[PDB]
């Protein structure tokens, strides 16, 4: 009846930072009952709100072993490939997702809004025709974690 894993916290490290900086998350979870399989964690960058086609899976890791207990790991993943991001979605708000999957089933989804912005007043007001990602600051809106759990089969 009870979910064998619950995620307790996520801390967003090294934020704000350049767009090119790796995403770095401290993730804390409790296992109330020994797992026989690995936990699969993903960081997914939403390249474009309009379409899921533009998702970038920044990394996918298998975490284990998972005996009952309180666990933490730091999940780091390289920044997205700007060559796949639509110019119009580059500057402004998007989302990054952290996801966990057990035996092929996603049981949790943590979302953060991400504001990508120039910091130079010249650029902010007169932004480049094509985005300059070397000059964009990524600000993950860490004070507002959005958390969604899903009922899965833990057997």
């Amino acid at each position: 009846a009870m979910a064998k894993v619950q995620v307790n916290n996520v801390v967003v490290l090294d934020n704000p930072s350049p767009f090119y900086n790796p995403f770095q998350f401290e993730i804390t979870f409790e296992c109330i009952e020994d797992l026989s399989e690995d936990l699969e964690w993903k960081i997914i960058y939403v390249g474009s709100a309009e379409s899921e086609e533009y998702d970038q899976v920044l990394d996918s890791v298998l975490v284990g072993p998972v005996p009952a207990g309180r666990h933490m790991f730091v999940f780091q993943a390289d920044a997205p490939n700007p060559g796949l991001i639509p110019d119009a979605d580059a500057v402004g708000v998007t989302v990054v997702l952290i996801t966990c999957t057990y035996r092929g089933q996603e049981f949790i989804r943590v979302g953060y809004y991400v504001n990508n912005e120039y910091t130079e007043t010249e650029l902010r007001e007169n932004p480049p025709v094509k985005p300059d990602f070397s000059k964009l600051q990524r600000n993950i809106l860490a004070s507002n974690p959005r958390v969604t759990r899903f009922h899965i089969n833990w057997e």
Binding site: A49, E50, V93, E106, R109, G111, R146, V147, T148, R149
Partner: peptide, 28 residues
């Protein structure tokens, strides 16, 4: 009078809730 999401905000809210879940503020 409750406000409304723009198409982009609404698109991002749907990604955040995944397969039709209830999105909460934080972890507990």
């Amino acid at each position: 009078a409750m406000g409304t999401l723009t198409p982009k905000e609404a698109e991002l809210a749907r990604r955040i809730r995944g397969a039709g879940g209830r999105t909460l503020n934080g972890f507990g």
